[PDB]
Copies of this chain bind each other. A is one copy, B any other.
Amino acid sequence: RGGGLCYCRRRFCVCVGR
């Protein structure tokens, strides 16, 4: 199935989806 990817580290976060 589909979903979403989110990465968080230190004082910053980034998410990506298609």
Contacts and interface: CB of A to CB of B under 8 A. Distances in A.
Interface of chain A: mostly helix, strand, loop or mixed:
strand
Interface string A1-18: 000101010011111111
Contacts of A4: 13
A17 B4 CA distance: 14
B18 A16 contact: no
Nearest to A17: B13
Given A12-B16, A13-B16, A13-B18, 13 more contacts: A4-B13, A6-B15, A8-B17, A11-B18, A12-B17, A12-B18, A13-B17, A14-B15, A14-B16, A14-B17, A15-B15, A15-B16, A15-B17
